[PDB]
Enzyme design. Structure first.
Site, PDB file in Angstrom:
ATOM      1  N   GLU A 110       1.421   4.031  -3.416  1.00  0.00           N
ATOM      2  CA  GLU A 110       1.159   5.474  -3.432  1.00  0.00           C
ATOM      3  C   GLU A 110       2.345   6.369  -3.836  1.00  0.00           C
ATOM      4  O   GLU A 110       2.189   7.322  -4.601  1.00  0.00           O
ATOM      5  CB  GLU A 110       0.598   5.924  -2.078  1.00  0.00           C
ATOM      6  CG  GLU A 110      -0.687   5.192  -1.777  1.00  0.00           C
ATOM      7  CD  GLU A 110      -1.903   5.726  -2.585  1.00  0.00           C
ATOM      8  OE1 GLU A 110      -1.832   6.922  -3.047  1.00  0.00           O
ATOM      9  OE2 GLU A 110      -2.906   4.962  -2.695  1.00  0.00           O
TER      10      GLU A 110
ATOM     11  N   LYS B 259       3.033   5.760  -7.587  1.00  0.00           N
ATOM     12  CA  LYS B 259       2.069   6.495  -8.364  1.00  0.00           C
ATOM     13  C   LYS B 259       2.399   8.018  -8.409  1.00  0.00           C
ATOM     14  O   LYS B 259       2.366   8.612  -9.475  1.00  0.00           O
ATOM     15  CB  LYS B 259       0.673   6.204  -7.876  1.00  0.00           C
ATOM     16  CG  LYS B 259      -0.393   7.198  -8.347  1.00  0.00           C
ATOM     17  CD  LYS B 259      -1.838   6.771  -7.912  1.00  0.00           C
ATOM     18  CE  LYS B 259      -2.095   6.934  -6.390  1.00  0.00           C
ATOM     19  NZ  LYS B 259      -1.349   8.107  -5.729  1.00  0.00           N
ATOM     20  N   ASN B 260       2.813   8.619  -7.297  1.00  0.00           N
ATOM     21  CA  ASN B 260       3.101  10.044  -7.268  1.00  0.00           C
ATOM     22  C   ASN B 260       4.369  10.362  -8.025  1.00  0.00           C
ATOM     23  O   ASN B 260       4.454  11.371  -8.761  1.00  0.00           O
ATOM     24  CB  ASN B 260       3.219  10.579  -5.812  1.00  0.00           C
ATOM     25  CG  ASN B 260       1.907  10.478  -5.062  1.00  0.00           C
ATOM     26  OD1 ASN B 260       0.889  10.289  -5.668  1.00  0.00           O
ATOM     27  ND2 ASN B 260       1.942  10.544  -3.756  1.00  0.00           N
TER      28      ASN B 260
ATOM     29  N   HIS C 226       0.843  -1.204   0.000  1.00  0.00           N
ATOM     30  CA  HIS C 226       0.000   0.000   0.000  1.00  0.00           C
ATOM     31  C   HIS C 226       0.879   1.254   0.000  1.00  0.00           C
ATOM     32  O   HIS C 226       0.712   2.175  -0.817  1.00  0.00           O
ATOM     33  CB  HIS C 226      -0.972   0.002   1.214  1.00  0.00           C
ATOM     34  CG  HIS C 226      -1.973   1.129   1.209  1.00  0.00           C
ATOM     35  ND1 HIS C 226      -3.345   0.908   1.155  1.00  0.00           N
ATOM     36  CD2 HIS C 226      -1.813   2.485   1.261  1.00  0.00           C
ATOM     37  CE1 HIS C 226      -3.982   2.077   1.174  1.00  0.00           C
ATOM     38  NE2 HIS C 226      -3.078   3.048   1.230  1.00  0.00           N
TER      39      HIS C 226
HETATM   40  C1  LIG Z   1       3.718  18.203  -6.499  1.00  0.00           C
HETATM   41  C2  LIG Z   1       4.649  17.158  -7.148  1.00  0.00           C
HETATM   42  C3  LIG Z   1       4.124  16.800  -8.535  1.00  0.00           C
HETATM   43  C4  LIG Z   1       2.743  16.093  -8.499  1.00  0.00           C
HETATM   44  O1  LIG Z   1       2.734  15.170  -9.574  1.00  0.00           O
HETATM   45  C5  LIG Z   1       2.916  14.569  -8.302  1.00  0.00           C
HETATM   46  C6  LIG Z   1       1.662  13.807  -7.922  1.00  0.00           C
HETATM   47  C7  LIG Z   1       1.229  13.687  -6.653  1.00  0.00           C
HETATM   48  C8  LIG Z   1       1.908  14.307  -5.501  1.00  0.00           C
HETATM   49  C9  LIG Z   1       1.743  13.880  -4.245  1.00  0.00           C
HETATM   50  C10 LIG Z   1       2.502  14.589  -3.141  1.00  0.00           C
HETATM   51  O2  LIG Z   1       1.950  14.886  -2.106  1.00  0.00           O
HETATM   52  C11 LIG Z   1       3.953  15.006  -3.259  1.00  0.00           C
HETATM   53  C12 LIG Z   1       4.867  14.005  -3.936  1.00  0.00           C
HETATM   54  C13 LIG Z   1       5.001  12.702  -3.390  1.00  0.00           C
HETATM   55 CL1  LIG Z   1       3.971  12.410  -1.996  1.00  0.00          CL
HETATM   56  C14 LIG Z   1       5.906  11.677  -3.968  1.00  0.00           C
HETATM   57  O3  LIG Z   1       5.873  10.472  -3.367  1.00  0.00           O
HETATM   58  C15 LIG Z   1       6.727  11.921  -5.054  1.00  0.00           C
HETATM   59  C16 LIG Z   1       6.671  13.191  -5.612  1.00  0.00           C
HETATM   60  O4  LIG Z   1       7.428  13.600  -6.669  1.00  0.00           O
HETATM   61  C17 LIG Z   1       5.766  14.231  -5.092  1.00  0.00           C
HETATM   62  C18 LIG Z   1       5.830  15.529  -5.793  1.00  0.00           C
HETATM   63  O5  LIG Z   1       6.874  16.136  -5.911  1.00  0.00           O
HETATM   64  O6  LIG Z   1       4.597  15.988  -6.316  1.00  0.00           O
END
Ligand SMILES: C[C@@H]1C[C@H]2O[C@@H]2/C=C\C=C\C(=O)Cc2c(Cl)c(O)cc(O)c2C(=O)O1
Ligand SMILES: C[C@@H]1C[C@H]2O[C@@H]2/C=C\C=C\C(=O)Cc2c(Cl)c(O)cc(O)c2C(=O)O1
Ligand SMILES: *C(=O)CCCC[C@@H](S)CCS
Ligand SMILES: *C(=O)CCCC[C@@H](S)CCS
Ligand SMILES: [K+]
Ligand SMILES: [K+]
Lengths: 93, 369, 369, 93
Positions: free
Chosen positions: B233, B236-237, B229
C-alpha cells in the site's frame, strides 16, 4: 443484622478462567460505584482484564487484598451497599 | 442472543507471535488448539457483534450490515456446536477443521460487504463529522478482530490440515523473515501495477542498518503476508505520488527510498518519496474510512495489531515519509484485540460535546477598521 | 470567586496573527486595545483558575500551587479595576499600561513555580499513570493560556509603551520573518552551550524548498521568539544526541540537518539527526511533564498555539526527525486557547476506566508445554 | 395552561457579545437534556462557541431556527420541560 448488602463474586472472566490474581483495586472503601466503573484489574494466565462494577452503590469493604494470587471463581471479593450511611456497618467484619 | 450477551462479556485472550511459534514448533497438539479455538473464536465474534448492534440505526439498517451480522451469527452458532464435543475423538477434530474452513470462506467477502454498508449510509444520510469518528472507531475494531480471526484460523488449518508451500514456516509465521526481501517483493508488485497504468514507475533504493549486528541481513519473526500487505500500500501511494508530480516535468523521476533499521525494541521501515506531500490539515482524515482507499487505515491496523504502528509525516511541497514500526522481539508481539465492555459501550453512546479548545468565528472582526 | 465563576463561563476570544498585524499596522488605537484587553485578560485568567481548582487535592495543596493561584487572583482583581474606567482619559490608558507590566512581572516565575508544584507532588505522593494524564492535560492548557497572556500583554506594551529594538516589527510580530535566519541563530545558541560542556558540537546544514517561488528565501509572518524557542530546544536535543553517540567512535560527527519547506498551507521545518534515536514505546512519554526538560512539550505548545504542530519520529538505532509545522498564511493562524466548560470539567472528573483494547498477562502461559 | 416549562435565553457568551448567530442545534426536539450537554454552536464576530445546556430536562420546542443571524441577547431560543410526556404540549405554540 447488617444493612442490605451485596457480595461481589469473582466471575469466570473468560471461558477457561478458573482463578485470577487481584492485581489492583481501582476503587477505595467509601467510594460511589456507578454501573460500568472500573473495579479491579484481574490477572490470569491469559490476560490482564479490567473487571467492571455490575451494580451501583458504595464500596463497603474489600474482602480480598490487592496482590492476592490464584483466587478461585466464586470467592467474594468485596461488599457493596446501597446507601453511604451503611458503609461504616462493615469496618466491623 | 442470550448466548451472545454472555460470550461478549468474556475477555479475549491475546496471543503473542512467540506463543504461536512456540506452539507450532515445539507443542503442535491439535487437541490444545481445538480446546483454545472452540471457545476463543466465539468470544471474539461475540465481542464484535455486540458492537455492531451499537451502531447508529441508519447504518445498522443497511442490508449489507444485516448480512454481516447474520454471517457472524451463523459462524458463532456453528462454533458453539463444539463446546461439549470431546477432542479424544478423531472425527470431532476432523469436523472442526472443515468448520473453520467454512467460516473463513463465509467471511471472505466481509471487508467489502461492510464497506458497501458504510458507503450506502454515507450516500443516503450524509457526512456528519462527529458520527464519522464513531464509525471510524467501530471499523478499526471490527477490521482488527477480523484480522485476528483469520490469524487463528490460518494457524490451525496450516498446522493440522495440505500443499506444503513455505516449509520452514510455522503456519503463517516465518521465524526468519528477511525484511528487505519482502520490501523488494512488495515493491515489484506495486511497480507492475503502476507501470501498467502510468507507463512508468520510480526505482526503489533500499538501505539497512542493523544496530545489534551492523552488517547482517535484518531478520524478524513475523507474518510475511501482513508485512507485504502494508508495504504494498505505501509503495503504491509513493509511486502514484511521484509519477503524478513528475509527469509534466523535465528532471525525471526520483527514486522511492526505503530505510530498514533494527534496534533493541524496534524494527522500523521508513518509505520516503518526493511526490509533493500533503498538507498537515488533511493527514488525520487519510485514516478516516468515510472521507475515503481503505488501504492506508487497514495497513495501519495490521501494524498496531502485533503492537507495532504505522505513522505518516509529510512536508507539503516536497514529499512524504511513511514509517512502519514492528516489535523486534516475538516475546513482545502480542495481539492487540478490541474488547467489548463499558468503555467500548460509552464510545457508541457519546453524544457531541462542546469543544475543549477555542474556535474562531468564520467571519472574524476586521481589525483594520 | 463569584466573579471568577462568571468570567470563567465567558468564552475566550482567539485572535489571528493577521488581526494582530492588521491592528498594529493600520489601526493602532490604544483605546481599542484597552477595551479588548481589560475584558479578555480576566476571561483568560478565570478560565485557567477554574481548572486549577479542579486539580487533585494533593496537588492543589502544595504551597507552589497556592502561590500561583494567589498570583492569578491578584492579577484578575487588578484588571477588574478597569471594567468601568473610561478610555477617554489619558491617565486610565497610562495606568492600565503599568498594570500590564506589573502582572507580566508577577507572572515571570510562573512556569518554574508550577513546575516546582508538580515536582513536590510527584516526590511526595508518587507516580500514578492515570493521574499523570490529568496533570498533563492541565499543564498543556495552563502553559498555553500563559503563552497567550504574554502575547497580548507584549503587543500592547510594545505598541503603546520604548527602546525601539526591532523597528519594522509590529509589536512582537515580524511581517517578513526569514525562517533560515532564525534557524541559524537558534543553532548557534545551542552550539555554544553544547561546545561549552561537551568540548565539541555537530555542524548545521540547511536546505530550503519554497514551492510557490522556488528560489526565493522562505519568509513567513510570525513571532520570531516563539520560532526561536522551538528551534533552540530541538537543536539542543539533536546535538546532545549526536555528541553522546559519537564521543566513543572513530567516524566523527554527523551534521544536524534542517529542511525548511513552504507549500500552499504549511511552512514545515524538519530537523534530522543521527543521534541513535528512541524506541517507539518511549515517544509519548517525552511529552509528559512528570516523566520529565519541559523543553519539548512546551515547544510543542508554542507550535499548536497558532494552529501549527510539533511532531517527532525516530528510528531506534539510527536517529530522529523532529518537525515543526506552522501555518503559511497569517489569515489562518488563530490562537488556539483552552476554554473552561463542561468538556474541560469532565477531563478533571474522569475516574479510571477499563481498557477498550486487550492487555496480555504479565506471565503468559508457556505454549511449549 | 401549559405544563411547567423553562425558556432558554441567549446569554452574553463573552464579555462584549451583544448578538449571536444560531449556527447549529446539537439537540433535537424530544431529546433528554443533561446538565452540560452541547445544545448549540453560536457564532459571533469573535468566536464560534459551544453553548451548553444549563438545566436538565427535555427539549420541547425550538424557538429560533438554525441559521438565524444576529439574534439579540435575551431572545428565547428554545423550551425545556421536566417530563417527556410534556413535550407534545408545545408542538402547539
Ligand atoms: C496526497 C499525496 C499524493 C497522492 O498520490 C498519492 C496517492 C495516494 C495517497 C495516499 C495517502 O493517504 C497519503 C500518502 C501516503 Cl499514505 C504514502 O504512503 C505516500 C505518499 O506520498 C502519500 C501522499 O503524499 O499522497
Ligand atoms: C533519547 C535521544 C537521545 C537523548 O540525547 C537526546 C537529548 C534529549 C532528548 C529529548 C527528547 O525528548 C527526544 C529527542 C528530541 Cl525531542 C530531538 O529533538 C532530537 C533527538 O535526537 C531526540 C532523541 O532521539 O533523544
Ligand atoms: C492459551 O490458552 C495458550 C494457547 C496456546 C495454543 C494457541 S497458540 C492456539 C494455536 S492457534
Ligand atoms: C476583537 O475584539 C478584535 C480585537 C482587535 C484588537 C486586538 S488585535 C487587541 C490588540 S492586543
Ligand atoms: K468482553
Ligand atoms: K468558558
Amino acid at each position: 443484622s447488617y444493612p442490605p448488602h451485596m457480595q461481589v463474586l469473582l466471575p469466570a472472566l473468560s471461558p477457561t478462567m478458573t482463578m485470577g490474581t487481584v492485581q489492583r483495586w481501582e476503587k477505595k472503601v467509601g467510594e460511589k460505584l456507578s454501573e460500568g466503573d472500573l473495579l479491579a484489574e484481574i490477572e490470569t494466565d491469559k490476560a490482564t482484564i479490567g473487571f467492571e462494577v455490575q451494580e451501583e452503590g458504595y464500596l463497603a469493604k474489600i474482602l480480598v487484598p490487592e496482590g492476592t494470587r490464584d483466587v478461585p471463581l466464586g470467592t467474594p471479593l468485596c461488599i457493596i451497599v446501597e446507601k453511604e450511611a451503611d458503609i461504616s456497618a462493615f469496618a466491623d467484619y | 442472543p442470550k448466548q451472545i450477551e454472555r460470550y461478549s462479556r468474556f475477555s479475549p485472550s491475546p496471543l503473542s507471535i512467540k506463543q504461536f511459534l512456540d506452539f507450532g514448533r515445539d507443542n503442535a497438539c491439535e487437541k490444545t488448539s481445538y480446546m483454545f479455538l472452540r471457545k476463543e473464536l466465539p468470544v471474539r465474534l461475540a465481542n464484535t457483534m455486540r458492537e455492531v448492534n451499537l451502531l447508529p440505526d441508519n447504518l445498522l439498517n443497511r442490508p449489507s450490515v444485516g448480512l454481516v451480522q447474520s454471517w457472524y451469527m451463523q459462524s458463532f452458532l456453528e462454533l458453539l456446536e463444539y463446546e461439549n464435543k470431546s477432542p479424544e475423538d478423531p472425527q470431532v477434530l476432523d469436523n472442526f477443521l472443515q468448520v473453520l474452513i467454512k467460516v473463513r470462506n463465509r467471511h471472505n467477502d466481509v471487508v467489502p460487504t461492510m464497506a458497501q454498508g458504510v458507503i450506502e449510509y454515507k450516500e443516503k444520510f450524509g457526512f456528519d463529522p462527529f458520527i464519522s469518528t464513531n464509525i471510524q472507531y467501530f471499523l478499526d475494531r471490527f477490521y482488527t478482530n477480523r484480522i485476528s480471526f483469520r490469524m487463528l484460523i490460518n494457524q490451525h488449518t496450516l498446522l493440522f490440515g495440505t500443499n506444503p508451500v513455505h516449509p520452514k514456516h510455522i503456519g503463517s509465521i516465518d521465524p526468519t523473515c528477511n525484511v528487505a526481501d519482502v520490501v523488494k517483493d512488495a515493491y515489484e508488485t506495486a511497480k507492475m501495477l503502476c507501470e501498467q497504468y502510468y507507463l512508468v514507475a520510480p526505482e526503489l533504493e533500499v538501505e539497512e542498518f542493523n544496530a545489534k549486528a551492523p552488517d547482517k541481513p535484518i531478520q524478524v519473526v513475523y507474518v510475511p503476508s501482513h508485512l507485504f500487505h502494508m508495504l504494498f500500500e505505501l509503495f503504491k501511494n509513493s509511486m502514484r505520488a511521484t509519477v503524478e508530480l513528475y509527469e509534466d516535468r523535465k528532471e525525471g523521476y526520483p527514486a522511492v527510498k526505503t530505510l530498514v533499521t533494527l534496534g533493541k525494541e524496534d524494527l522500523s521501515i521508513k518509505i520516503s518519496d518526493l511526490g509533493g506531500g500533503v498538507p498537515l490539515r488533511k493527514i488525520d482524515r487519510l485514516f478516516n474510512y468515510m472521507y475515503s482507499g481503505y488501504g492506508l487505515p487497514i495497513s495501519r491496523l495490521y501494524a498496531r495489531y502485533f503492537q507495532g504502528d504505522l505513522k505518516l509525516y509529510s512536508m507539503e511541497g516536497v514529499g512524504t515519509d511513511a514509517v512502519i514500526y514492528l516489535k523486534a522481539l516475538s516475546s513482545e508481539s502480542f495481539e492487540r484485540l478490541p474488547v467489548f465492555n463499558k468503555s467500548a459501550w460509552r464510545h457508541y453512546k457519546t453524544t457531541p460535546e462542546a469543544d475543549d479548545w477555542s474556535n474562531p468565528s468564520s467571519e472574524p472582526r476586521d481589525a483594520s477598521k
